[PDB]
Specification:
This is part of a larger assembly, with eight protein chains of eight kinds.
Chain A: H1 23-27, H2 30-41, H3 52-55, H4 58-89
Helix pairs in contact in A: 2-4
Chain D: H1 2-20, H2 25-31, H3 34-37, H4 52-59, H5 61-78, H6 91-101, H7 113-118, H8 152-166, H9 174-179, H10 187-190, H11 201-218, H12 237-250, H13 260-269, H14 276-282, H15 296-299
Chain H: H1 15-21, H2 33-49
Classes of the chains: A mainly alpha (about 110), B mainly alpha (about 100), C mainly alpha (about 100), D mainly alpha (about 350), E mainly alpha (about 140), F mainly alpha (about 325), G mainly alpha (about 450), H mainly alpha (about 55).
The complex binds cardiolipin (CDL), 1,2-diacyl-SN-glycero-3-phosphocholine (2 copies) and 1,2-Distearoyl-sn-glycerophosphoethanolamine (3PE) (2 copies).
C-alpha cells in the first residue's frame, strides 16, 4: 500500500500480465463497436454503414485504454491477498486449528415431517 | 479525494505553516514547543487508531499546557482556601 | 478566559432570522460583513499570546477574500435595485 | 467575451483542485471560496430578471455555508493547534462542520438551494457545471471521515431520499425533475460513508456520467414535459429510444448499469449487521422511479404530436462526447468485476 | 435524549403502570414541539402569538398519544399472564393510534391510523427481543 | 456571420464588412401597389439582394435542390382556397397564418445571416411586422375566432427578441382604395368580390398600427400616390442614399451596435441566426389543442413516413 | 448450456440484416432448428446428477422445463402477423428482436447454477415485457396496467437482495447449489420468521395468492397484437418456479408458519374460479382460470414429501400448453369480430366447422379425461394432500366440480344460431389459423405415452 | 363487490396517500426567502438539544 500517487507502481512486474484474447477485452470495445454505430444513428447519417474512419478509432480507443486499465485491477487483488496472508501468518491466537470430527459426533435435530 | 501531488514532486505548496513547531524564521518558539515535539514523536508509524488509546499521556498534558485548565483551578481555589480568613490573620507574606 | 466568551457570544450576529430577513436586504448584507471581526478577532487573540510566529499572516489574508466576496455580493444588490429601485426581500417570483 | 469566458470557466476547476491538494485548513478555505466567486458570472450571461433574482438566492446560501466552515477551523485551532486535514479533535467542531458543509451538497435540510436555483435559469444549456460543487465537498468528507457522530450523517441522509423523492411527483418542469433526484443520489452515498468510505466514489463516478448524458439529450429544444412529446415524430425517433434507455438505466434496473451501485453498496451496508437501514432506503427509491415511468409514458407512446410544424432541415448543435456516454452508462454491468479495485 | 430511553427501557418492564406512562408521554409530548416549530416556520405567519399554526391541535394531539401508550401496555402486561410480549405490546398500537382517529374524524383515517400503527408497534420491543441494532459499527 | 468560437477569435464579423453598407431596408405597401413595380427595380445601383414576399413553398425553396414538394406534406390552408373565407368550418383558415408566419420569419433570419456574412443591403417585401395588419380585417370579417388571435400575439413577444429593425422603411405609393379595380383589371380570378371590410380596414391599419416603428428611430420615407414612375424612383434612390449614412439613424438601434467588439451584438445575433432551426425553435404550438392548429397522432401522423423516404437524400460510405 | 444462448443470439443480426417481407420467413426458419439442438445434449442421465459445465449451468437436470421455452419464438411470429402488418418495417424489426431478447435471459434462467445468478436474471426480464405492454396494445388502461405490472414484482423482489446477500456472507457462499451440503437448520425465532418470509414473498407476487393477484387480470386483459407476449407471460408466471430450488433446502424445517399460505391459497382456489362464471370479457374468462389451477401448486410445494413433486412439476407444464392455446383460440376469432365480448360471437359452429375440434380438445383438457398430462398431475396432488389431512378432499373436490361447469360455459356459448347480423366473418380459418392452433395438442397428448420425461428428481 | 373493492381499497390507498403528502412540500415551499432562513435556524438549534450530536 506504499509508494503513493502512481497509476500503477513499479512492483507490478511479477503479475502475469493479463494478455489478450480474454473475453473482457473482446467485450471492451464491443460496446465501442456498438457505440460507433450509434454515432452515425444520432445524426441522420442515414447509412448505418457510414464512414469507416469514424467507425474505426473507437475500436482502437477502448481496447488500448481498457488493457492499460486492467493491469492495476489484477494488481489490487494481488496486493489485497498479499497483506491478508501475512496477518494470517502472524498472530496464530486469532487463527485456531479446528478439530476434524466425522459424522459420529453430531446429534442434529432430528425433525421429520 | 486526497490526490497528494506534493508528496510525489518535492515542492512544498504549504506544509510549513501547519504545526506549532516547524521553522520559526528567527528561531523563537511557542509556549508549548516542548510538548509538540514530544507528542509528534509518539504517533509516527502508528496508524492513529491505536494512538488514541495507547499514547494518551503526551497529548493530555499538551492540551493542559495550552489552555492551563486545572492550573487555573488550583490557583482559583487558593482564593477560596484563604481570603475568607482576610480578617482571621495570616497576611502571608508581609511586604515585600 | 472571559475574553473568549465575550467574544463568542458576539459570534451570534449571524442570527439567521436576521441574516436574510426582513426587508431592506442591505440590513442583511450588513451582518454578513459584520460577521467578520468576530472571526478576525477570535483568530487574532489566539495566534498572538501563543507565539506561533507564522500563522499571524492568516488574519491578514482573512480580510482580503471577505472584502472581495462582499464586494461581489454588493454588485448584485444594485442589480436588484437597478430593476426595481427597492431591494425588499419579500420580492419572490421563482418558486421552489 | 470569448477568451474571458474560458478564463472564468478554467478557474472553476482550478478552485476545486486546491481543495484536494492541501494539507492545511487555510487553503481549503480559499479553494471553494473562489468557486463561489467564479460561478456568479455563468449564472448571468443573457441578463434576464429571474436569473438576477436567482443567483442572489444562490449567493448568500453559499456565503454562510462558507462562513461556518471558517468558524469550525478556528475552534480546533484552540485545541492542539494542528492544521492538517484530519480528525477534528472536538465534538463541538465536527458537529458544526458536517451540517455546515451539508448546504453546499444540499442535503434534505437546507432544502431549497437545489430547486430554486436550477429552475428558470435561462441558461439551461449547462449548469452541468453543478457537478463540480457536488464534487468539491465530497473530497473533503474523505478525510474528515473518522470523526463524526454517526447519527447526524445518517439523519441528513435518511431524510434525503424520503423528501427528495416526494418533492417531485408534483412537477412538470424537467429542470426541477433533474434538480430533484439529485438530492436522492446524494442520499445513497452519504448513508454509506461511515462504513468503508470507498465504494462511495463508485456511486459518484456513475452519478457524473448518467447526469451529464441527460442534459446533452435535452439540448435540442426541450423545456417542459409537453415539449418532450413533440420531438418523437418531428426531430428524430431515435432520440425517443435513447431517452428511454438512460432513464430506465438511472432508475436502477438490473438489465442496465444503474443497478451497479446498489448491488455493490448493500454488500457493504450489510456485512455490518445493519439490515433495517438498507431495507428502508431500497424500498424508498421505488417511488423515485415514478418520476421516470410517467416520464417515459410521454415520449415513447406518440402522445399527441399536434400543431403541424416541420423541421425539414438537419440539426447542427454540438453533442460533445455523446456517442460514448450511453455505452458506458448502460452496458457496463457485466464489464465491472472490479471497477472498485481501480478506484480503491 | 438517549437516557430517557435508559429510564424507559430499564426499570418498569410491564409493571408500575404510572411511571411507565409518565415517561412515555414525555417523548411523544416532546415531538409535538418539533412539528409545531416547522408549522410556524415553513408555514407563513399565524395569529398574534406565534406559534399559533393554522388548525392548531398539534401538541394537543401528540402528548395525548404517549399518555395512553404506556397505559394500554402496562395494564395489559400484568393482567393476562405476566410477561411482556410482542402480542402484549401489539395492543397499544391500535387504540394508541386512535387518538389521531378520534379527532379529525375517522372512516378513512382512523382505522388506517389503527392498522399501520399496530404494525410499527410490536416491532420495537421485538427489536431488543432479537437484539436488533439500527445504527451499528463492526 | 460567426463560425464557432475558434474562427471568431482570429477574425471577427461585426464591422469590417458592414462599412455603413448594412442598410437593412423593407417596404410595407398595399395589394397590387408595391409588389415589384418599385421594390425589385432597385437592386442595383445600391447592391441590394431582393427577397420575395411569401408563399407556402419557402421551406421547399430551401434545403436543396429544391423543387417544391406538393401541398399534401406542407398541408396549409391553400392560397386560392381560403378566398371562400369559411366563417363556419372544421377548418381551418387560421392554420394558414401559422405557416404564413414561419415562412415569414426564415426570410428575416436569412436576412441578418446574409449581411454580416457579406455586407450587402437587402430589400424585403413585407417584414415580420406586416403580419398583424391582415389580422385587423381578418378579425372583423367573420372567418377567424378569438383564442387564435391571442396565440401569435403571444408568439410575437416570444419569438421577436433579437431583431434589429429596418432602416428607411417605405410605405409605398398606395391609392385611395383603387385596389377594387386593381384586384379586377390585373387578373386575379380567385381574389374576388369581398367588399370594403377587407379593403378599408387594412388600409386604416397601416396608419395606426405601423406608426410606432414608423416613429422608431429609423427614419421612414413615405409616399402616397399612384406610383413612383421617375418621380419617386430617383427621389427614393438618391435621397434615400443620402439617408443611408447622413440622415439615417437617431438612437441607432440596429448598427450591430456598441457590443460589436466581439460582444453580444456582434456574435450573439450572428451565431443565433445561423442554422435556422433554432430560429423557429419557440414556434412550437399550443398548450395542447387550440382547436385549429392540430395534427392527429397517427392519421395524419402517418403522413410523415411518406415524407421520410431515406430521411436524408445522398451520403455514401468511406467519407 | 454449452451454446444454446450462442446460436439464439445469432438469430438477432439476421432479422435486420435481411431484405423486405422475407423478414418473416427468415426468422421462423432458423428458430425451429434449435429444437433439435435443445433436445440434443440434454435429457441425459441421471442418477445424482448432471452438473453441466461451470458456474453457468447445472443443466436443469431434474426439472427439464426448458424445451417448452424454445417452441415459442417459432410459435408467436406466426401468431403475431394477424394485426401487426400495418406498421413500419423499422418497428417490425424491433418487435422480433426484443422477443428474442426475452428468450435470451430465460435460457440462462431455469439453469443458473446459483441463487444470485438467478435473481439478476429473475429481474433481467420485466423490461422487455413492459415494452410489449405499453406500446402495441389497444385502447387505454394500458398505462396504469403497465404500472400494476411493476411495483408488485419489484416491491417484493428487493427484499430478496437483502436476504440473499445475507446468506452469501453468513454460511460460506451460496454460489453453488452443490455447496449446499453444509446447511445449518433454521429454528423458531423472531428474526428467522422474516428470513423465511422475505425470501418467499417475492415468488408469491408472480404466481399469485388470492390476495395480491390484482395485477394478473390487468396485463392479460389489455394485451398485445395476438396474445404475443401473453403466451410469454404465462410461461413467465410458471417461470417463478425457483421456490422449488430454494425451499427444499435453505430453511427446510419451517412448516410452522405455512398455514397462512395454505388456507389463503386453498380457500382462495375454491373461490377465484367461482368468481369467473359471470365474466363478460372473453380474454378475462381465461385469465382467472390461470389463477385457480396455478395456485394448486402453492399448496403442493409447501406441503413437501413427493408424490406431490411427481404432480407439481407436471402441473407447471400442464397448462403451459393448455392456457397458451386458449389464448390462441381467443387471439383468433377476434380478427373477425372486433369485440372480446362473449355475448356477441354467437351464431357460430355452423360458419367455422373445422375449429370446433380446436375448442373441444382445448376444453377437454380441463375436464382432463384421465390419460393426458393433466389428470396424471392433479391425481398426484390429490393423493398427496389427502395425506396432510383427510378434510382437504372436500374443497379440492368442489374445485373439480365448478371448473367442469366453467369450461363448458365457454364452449356452449358458440353452439347457438341465426347470427342476426355479421355480413363480415367470412374467412374460413385459413392455413395459418390451424397451424399455430396445432403444435399444441400434438405434443400435449403425445407425451402421455411415456411421461417419465416429465418428472422431478423426485 | 369484493375482489375489485377490498383488495383495491388497501393498496391503491397508498397511491392516494403519498400524493396527499407530495403536495404539502411544493405548495409550502412557495418562495419566501424570509422563511427559508427562519427554518434553517430551527434546524441548527434542534441539533443542539436533541441527541448524540454534541456527544
Ligand atoms: C409399406 C410401408 C413401408 C414399410 C414400413 C415398415 C414396416 C412397419 C414398421 C414396423 C412396425 C414399426 C411401427 C412402430 C409403431 C408400432 C411399434 C410397436 O408396436 O412395437 C414397439 C417397438 C418397440 O421395439 P422393441 O425392440 O420391442 O423394444 C425397444 C424399446 O426398449 C421398447 O420400449 P420403448 O422405449 O419403445 O417404450 C415404449 C413406448 C415409448 O415410446 C414413447 O412413448 C414415445 C412416444 C411419445 C413421445 C413423447 C415425447 C415427445 C416430446 O413406445 C410407444 O409409445 C409405443 C406406441 C407406438 C409407437 C409410438 C410412436 C411415436 C410417435 O417400437 C417402438 O417403440 C418404436 C416406435 C417408433 C415409431 C416409428 C414411426 C412409425 C410411423 C408409421 C406411420 C404409418 C402411417 C400409415 C398410415 C395409416 C393410415 C390408416
Ligand atoms: C495536479 C492534479 C491534476 C489532476 C486533477 C484531476 C481533477 C480531479 C478529477 C476528478 C475525477 C474523479 C475521479 C476520482 C477517482 C480517481 C480515479 C482513480 O481511481 O485513479 C487515481 C489513481 C490512483 O490513486 P492512488 O491509488 O495513487 O491514491 C489515491 C487514492 N484515492 C483516489 C482513493 C485517494 O491516481 C493516479 O495515479 C492518477 C492517474
Ligand atoms: C497577453 C497578456 C498581457 C496582458 C494584456 C491584457 C490586455 C491589454 C489590452 C491590450 C490593448 C490592445 C489595444 C489594441 C488591440 C487591437 C484591437 C483589436 O483588434 O482587438 C483585439 C482584442 C484586444 O482587446 P481590446 O481590449 O483592445 O478590445 C476588445 C474588446 N473587448 C474588450 C470587449 C473584448 O483582442 C481580443 O479581443 C481577444 C482578447 C479577449 C479579451 C482580452 C482578455 C484576454 C487576453 C488574452 C489572453
Ligand atoms: C441494419 C441497421 C438498420 C437498418 C438500416 C438503418 C435504417 C435506419 O436508419 O433506422 C434506424 C433504426 C432507428 O429506429 P427509428 O429511428 O425509429 O426509425 C426511423 C429511422 N429514420 O434503428 C437503428 O439501426 C439505430 C441503431 C441501433 C443500434 C444498432 C443496431 C442496428 C443493427 C445493425 C448493427 C448490427 C451489429 C450490432 C448488433 C449485434 C447484435 C449481436
Ligand atoms: C418489515 C421490516 C422489518 C425487518 C426487520 C429486520 C429483520 C432483521 O433484523 O434481520 C434479521 C437477520 C439478521 O439480522 P441480525 O439480528 O443482526 O442477525 C444476527 C447477526 N449476528 O436475518 C436477516 O438477514 C433477514 C434479512 C432479510 C429480511 C429483510 C426484509 C424484511 C421485510 C420484507 C417483508 C416482506 C415484503 C414486505 C415489503 C413489500 C411490501 C412493501
Amino acid at each position: 500500500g506504499r509508494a503513493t500517487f502512481q497509476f500503477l507502481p513499479d512492483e507490478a512486474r511479477s503479475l502475469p500480465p493479463p494478455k489478450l484474447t480474454d473475453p473482457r477485452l473482446a467485450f471492451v470495445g464491443f460496446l465501442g463497436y456498438c457505440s460507433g454505430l450509434i454515432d452515425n444513428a444520432i445524426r441522420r447519417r442515414p447509412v448505418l454503414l457510414a464512414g469507416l474512419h469514424r467507425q474505426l478509432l473507437y475500436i482502437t480507443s477502448f481496447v488500448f485504454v481498457g488493457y492499460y486499465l486492467l493491469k492495476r485491477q489484477d494488481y489490487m487483488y494481488a496486493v489485497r491477498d498479499h497483506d491478508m496472508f501475512s496477518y494470517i501468518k502472524s498472530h496464530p491466537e486469532d487463527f485456531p486449528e479446528k478439530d476434524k470430527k466425522t459424522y459420529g459426533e453430531v446429534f442434529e435435530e432430528f425433525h421429520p415431517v | 479525494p486526497f490526490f497528494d501531488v506534493q508528496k510525489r514532486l518535492g515542492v512544498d505548496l504549504d506544509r510549513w505553516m501547519t504545526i506549532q513547531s516547524a521553522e520559526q524564521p528567527h528561531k523563537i518558539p511557542s509556549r508549548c514547543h516542548a510538548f509538540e515535539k514530544e507528542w509528534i514523536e509518539c504517533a509516527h508509524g502508528i496508524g492513529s487508531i491505536r494512538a488514541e488509546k495507547e499514547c494518551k499521556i503526551e497529548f493530555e498534558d499538551f492540551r493542559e499546557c495550552l489552555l492551563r485548565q486545572k492550573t487555573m483551578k488550583r490557583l482559583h481555589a487558593i482564593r477560596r482556601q484563604r481570603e475568607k480568613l482576610i480578617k482571621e490573620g495570616k497576611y502571608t507574606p508581609p511586604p515585600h | 478566559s472571559m475574553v473568549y466568551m465575550n467574544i463568542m457570544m458576539a459570534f451570534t450576529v449571524s442570527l439567521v432570522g436576521l441574516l436574510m430577513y426582513r426587508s431592506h436586504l442591505m440590513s442583511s448584507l450588513l451582518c454578513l460583513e459584520g460577521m467578520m471581526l468576530s472571526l478576525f478577532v477570535m483568530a487574532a487573540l489566539t495566534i498572538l499570546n501563543s507565539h506561533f510566529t507564522l500563522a499571524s499572516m492568516m488574519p491578514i489574508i482573512l480580510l482580503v477574500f471577505a472584502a472581495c466576496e462582499a464586494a461581489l455580493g454588493l454588485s448584485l444588490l444594485v442589480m436588484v435595485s437597478n430593476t426595481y429601485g427597492t431591494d425588499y426581500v419579500q420580492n419572490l417570483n421563482l418558486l421552489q | 467575451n470569448p477568451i474571458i469566458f474560458i478564463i472564468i470557466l478554467l478557474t472553476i476547476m482550478l478552485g476545486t483542485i486546491i481543495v484536494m491538494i492541501s494539507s492545511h485548513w487555510l487553503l481549503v478555505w480559499i479553494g471553494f471560496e473562489m468557486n463561489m466567486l467564479a460561478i456568479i458570472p455563468i449564472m448571468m450571461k443573457n441578463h434576464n430578471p429571474r436569473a438576477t433574482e436567482a443567483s442572489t438566492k444562490y449567493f448568500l446560501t453559499q456565503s454562510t455555508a462558507s462562513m461556518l466552515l471558517m468558524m469550525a477551523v478556528i475552534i480546533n485551532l484552540m485545541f492542539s493547534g494542528q492544521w492538517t486535514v484530519m480528525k477534528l479533535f472536538n465534538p463541538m467542531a465536527s458537529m458544526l462542520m458536517t451540517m455546515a458543509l451539508a448546504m453546499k451538497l444540499g442535503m434534505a435540510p437546507f432544502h431549497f438551494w437545489v430547486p430554486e436555483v436550477t429552475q428558470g435559469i435561462p441558461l439551461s444549456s449547462g449548469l452541468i457545471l453543478l457537478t463540480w460543487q457536488k464534487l468539491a465537498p465530497m473530497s473533503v468528507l474523505y478525510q474528515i471521515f473518522p470523526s463524526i457522530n454517526l447519527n447526524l450523517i445518517l439523519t441528513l441522509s435518511v431524510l434525503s431520499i424520503l423528501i427528495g423523492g416526494w418533492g417531485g411527483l408534483n412537477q412538470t418542469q424537467l429542470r426541477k425533475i433533474m434538480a430533484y433526484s439529485s438530492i436522492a443520489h446524494m442520499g445513497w452515498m452519504t448513508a454509506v460513508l461511515p462504513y468503508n468510505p470507498t465504494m462511495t466514489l463508485l456511486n459518484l463516478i456513475i452519478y457524473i456520467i448518467m447526469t451529464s448524458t441527460m442534459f446533452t439529450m435535452f439540448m435540442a429544444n426541450s423545456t417542459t414535459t409537453t415539449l418532450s412529446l413533440s420531438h418523437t415524430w418531428n426531430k428524430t425517433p431515435i432520440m425517443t429510444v435513447l431517452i428511454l434507455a438512460t432513464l430506465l438505466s438511472m432508475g436502477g434496473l438490473p438489465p442496465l448499469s444503474g443497478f451497479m451501485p446498489k448491488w455493490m453498496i448493500i454488500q457493504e451496508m450489510t456485512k455490518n449487521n445493519s439490515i433495517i437501514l438498507p431495507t428502508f432506503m431500497a424500498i424508498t427509491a421505488l417511488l423515485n422511479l415514478y418520476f421516470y415511468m410517467r416520464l417515459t409514458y410521454s415520449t415513447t407512446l406518440t402522445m399527441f404530436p399536434s400543431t403541424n410544424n416541420m423541421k425539414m432541415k438537419w440539426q447542427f448543435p454540438l453533442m460533445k462526447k455523446m456517442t460514448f456516454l450511453p455505452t458506458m452508462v448502460v452496458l457496463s454491468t457485466m464489464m465491472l468485476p472490479l471497477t472498485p479495485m481501480l478506484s480503491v | 435524549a438517549k437516557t430517557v430511553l435508559r429510564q424507559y427501557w430499564d426499570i418498569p418492564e410491564g409493571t408500575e403502570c404510572h411511571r411507565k406512562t409518565y415517561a412515555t408521554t414525555s417523548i411523544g409530548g416532546a415531538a409535538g414541539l418539533v412539528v409545531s416549530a416547522y408549522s410556524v416556520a415553513l408555514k407563513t405567519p399565524t395569529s398574534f402569538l406565534e406559534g399559533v399554526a393554522r388548525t392548531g391541535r398539534y401538541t394537543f394531539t401528540a402528548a395525548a398519544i404517549g399518555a395512553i401508550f404506556g397505559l394500554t401496555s402496562c395494564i395489559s402486561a400484568q393482567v393476562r399472564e405476566k410477561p411482556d410480549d410482542p402480542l402484549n405490546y401489539l395492543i397499544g398500537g391500535c387504540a394508541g393510534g386512535l387518538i389521531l382517529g378520534a379527532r379529525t374524524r375517522s372512516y378513512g383515517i382512523g382505522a388506517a391510523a389503527c392498522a399501520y400503527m399496530g404494525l410499527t408497534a410490536a416491532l420495537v420491543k421485538m427489536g431488543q427481543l432479537e437484539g436488533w441494532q439500527v445504527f451499528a459499527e463492526p | 456571420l460567426q463560425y464557432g468560437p475558434l474562427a471568431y477569435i482570429l477574425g471577427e464579423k461585426a464591422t469590417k464588412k458592414m462599412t455603413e453598407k448594412s442598410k437593412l431596408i423593407t417596404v410595407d405597401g398595399n395589394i397590387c401597389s408595391g409588389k415589384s413595380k418599385l421594390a425589385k427595380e432597385i437592386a442595383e445601383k445600391l447592391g441590394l439582394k431582393h427577397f420575395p414576399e411569401a408563399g407556402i413553398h419557402y421551406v421547399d425553396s430551401t434545403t436543396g435542390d429544391g423543387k417544391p414538394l406538393p401541398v399534401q406534406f406542407s398541408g396549409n390552408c391553400s392560397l386560392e382556397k381560403f378566398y371562400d373565407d369559411p366563417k363556419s368550418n372544421d377548418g381551418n383558415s387560421y392554420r394558414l397564418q401559422a405557416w404564413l408566419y414561419a415562412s415569414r420569419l426564415l426570410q428575416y433570419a436569412d436576412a441578418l445571416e446574409h449581411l454580416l456574412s457579406t455586407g450587402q443591403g437587402v430589400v424585403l417585401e413585407r417584414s415580420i411586422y406586416s403580419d398583424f395588419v391582415f389580422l385587423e380585417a381578418m378579425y372583423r370579417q367573420g372567418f377567424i375566432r378569438k383564442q387564435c388571435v391571442d396565440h401569435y400575439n403571444q408568439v410575437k413577444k416570444v419569438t421577436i427578441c433579437e431583431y434589429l429593425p429596418p432602416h428607411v422603411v417605405v410605405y409605398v405609393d398606395v391609392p385611395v382604395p383603387e385596389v377594387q379595380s386593381r384586384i379586377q383589371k390585373k387578373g386575379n380570378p380567385h381574389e374576388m368580390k369581398i367588399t370594403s371590410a377587407y379593403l378599408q380596414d387594412i388600409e386604416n391599419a397601416y396608419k395606426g398600427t405601423f406608426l410606432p416603428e414608423m416613429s422608431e428611430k429609423c427614419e421612414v420615407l413615405q409616399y402616397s400616390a399612384w406610383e413612383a414612375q421617375d418621380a419617386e424612383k430617383v427621389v427614393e434612390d438618391i435621397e434615400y442614399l443620402k439617408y443611408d449614412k447622413g440622415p439615417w439613424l437617431d438612437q441607432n438601434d440596429r448598427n450591430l451596435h456598441k457590443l460589436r467588439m466581439l460582444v453580444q451584438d456582434k456574435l450573439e445575433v450572428l451565431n443565433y441566426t445561423s442554422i435556422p432551426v433554432f430560429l423557429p425553435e419557440v414556434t412550437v404550438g399550443a398548450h395542447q389543442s387550440d382547436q385549429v392548429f392540430q395534427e392527429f397522432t397517427e392519421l395524419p401522423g402517418r403522413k410523415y413516413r411518406a415524407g421520410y423516404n431515406e430521411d436524408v437524400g445522398d451520403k455514401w460510405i468511406w467519407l | 448450456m454449452l451454446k444454446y444462448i450462442i446460436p439464439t443470439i445469432m438469430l438477432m443480426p439476421l432479422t435486420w440484416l435481411s431484405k423486405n417481407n422475407m423478414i418473416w420467413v427468415n426468422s421462423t426458419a432458423h428458430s425451429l432448428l434449435i429444437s433439435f439442438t435443445s433436445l440434443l445434449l440434454m435429457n441425459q442421465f441421471g442418477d445424482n446428477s448432471l452438473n453441466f459445465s461451470l458456474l453457468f449451468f447445472s443443466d436443469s437436470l431434474s426439472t427439464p422445463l426448458l424445451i417448452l421455452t424454445m417452441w415459442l419464438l417459432p410459435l408467436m411470429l406466426m401468431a403475431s402477423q394477424h394485426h401487426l402488418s400495418k406498421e413500419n418495417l423499422t418497428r417490425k424489426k424491433l418487435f422480433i428482436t426484443m422477443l428474442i431478447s426475452l428468450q435470451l435471459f430465460l435460457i440462462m434462467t431455469f439453469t443458473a447454477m446459483e441463487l444470485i445468478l438467478f435473481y439478476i436474471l429473475f429481474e433481467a426480464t420485466l423490461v422487455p415485457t413492459l415494452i410489449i405492454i405499453t406500446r402495441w396494445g389497444n385502447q387505454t388502461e394500458r398505462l396504469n396496467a403497465g404500472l400494476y405490472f411493476l411495483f408488485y414484482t419489484l416491491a417484493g423482489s428487493l427484499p430478496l437482495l437483502v436476504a440473499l446477500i445475507y446468506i452469501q456472507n453468513t454460511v460460506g457462499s451460496l454460489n453453488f447449489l452443490m455447496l449446499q451440503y453444509w446447511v445449518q437448520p433454521v429454528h423458531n425465532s423472531w428474526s428467522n420468521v422474516f428470513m423465511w418470509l422475505a425470501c418467499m414473498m417475492a415468488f408469491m407476487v408472480k404466481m399469485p395468492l388470492y390476495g395480491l393477484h390484482l395485477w394478473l387480470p390487468k396485463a392479460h386483459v389489455e394485451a398485445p397484437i395476438a396474445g404475443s407476449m401473453v403466451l410469454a407471460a404465462v410461461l413467465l408466471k410458471l417461470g417463478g418456479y425457483g421456490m422449488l430450488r430454494i425451499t427444499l433446502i435453505l430453511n427446510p424445517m419451517t412448516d410452522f408458519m405455512a398455514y397462512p399460505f395454505i388456507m389463503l391459497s386453498l380457500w382462495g382456489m375454491i373461490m377465484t374460479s367461482s368468481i369467473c362464471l359471470r365474466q363478460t370479457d372473453l380474454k378475462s374468462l381465461i385469465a382467472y382460470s390461470s389463477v385457480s389451477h396455478m395456485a394448486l401448486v402453492i399448496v403442493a410445494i409447501l406441503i413437501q414429501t413427493p408424490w406431490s413433486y411427481m404432480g407439481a412439476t407436471a402441473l407447471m407444464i400442464a397448462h403451459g400448453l393448455t392456457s397458451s392455446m386458449l389464448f390462441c383460440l381467443a387471439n383468433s376469432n377476434y380478427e373477425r369480430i372486433h369485440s372480446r365480448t362473449m355475448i356477441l360471437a354467437r351464431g357460430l359452429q355452423t360458419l367455422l366447422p373445422l375449429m370446433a375440434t380446436w375448442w373441444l380438445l382445448a376444453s377437454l383438457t380441463n375436464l382432463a379425461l384421465p390419460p393426458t398430462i393433466n389428470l396424471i398431475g392433479e391425481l398426484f396432488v390429490v393423493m398427496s394432500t389427502f395425506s396432510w389431512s383427510n378434510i382437504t378432499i372436500i374443497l379440492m373436490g368442489v374445485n373439480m366440480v365448478i371448473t367442469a361447469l366453467y369450461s363448458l360455459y365457454m364452449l356452449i356459448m358458440t353452439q347457438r344460431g341465426k347470427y342476426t347480423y355479421h355480413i363480415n366473418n367470412i374467412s374460413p380459418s385459413f392455413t395459418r389459423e390451424n397451424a399455430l392452433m396445432s403444435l399444441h395438442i400434438l405434443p400435449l397428448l403425445l407425451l402421455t405415452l411415456n411421461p417419465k420425461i416429465i418428472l422431478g428428481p423426485l | 363487490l369484493l375482489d375489485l373493492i377490498w383488495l383495491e381499497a388497501i393498496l391503491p390507498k397508498t397511491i392516494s396517500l403519498a400524493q396527499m403528502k407530495a403536495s404539502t412540500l411544493v405548495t409550502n415551499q412557495k418562495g419566501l426567502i424570509k422563511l427559508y432562513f427562519l427554518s434553517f435556524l430551527i434546524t441548527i438549534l434542534i441539533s443542539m438539544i436533541l441527541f448524540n450530536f454534541h456527544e
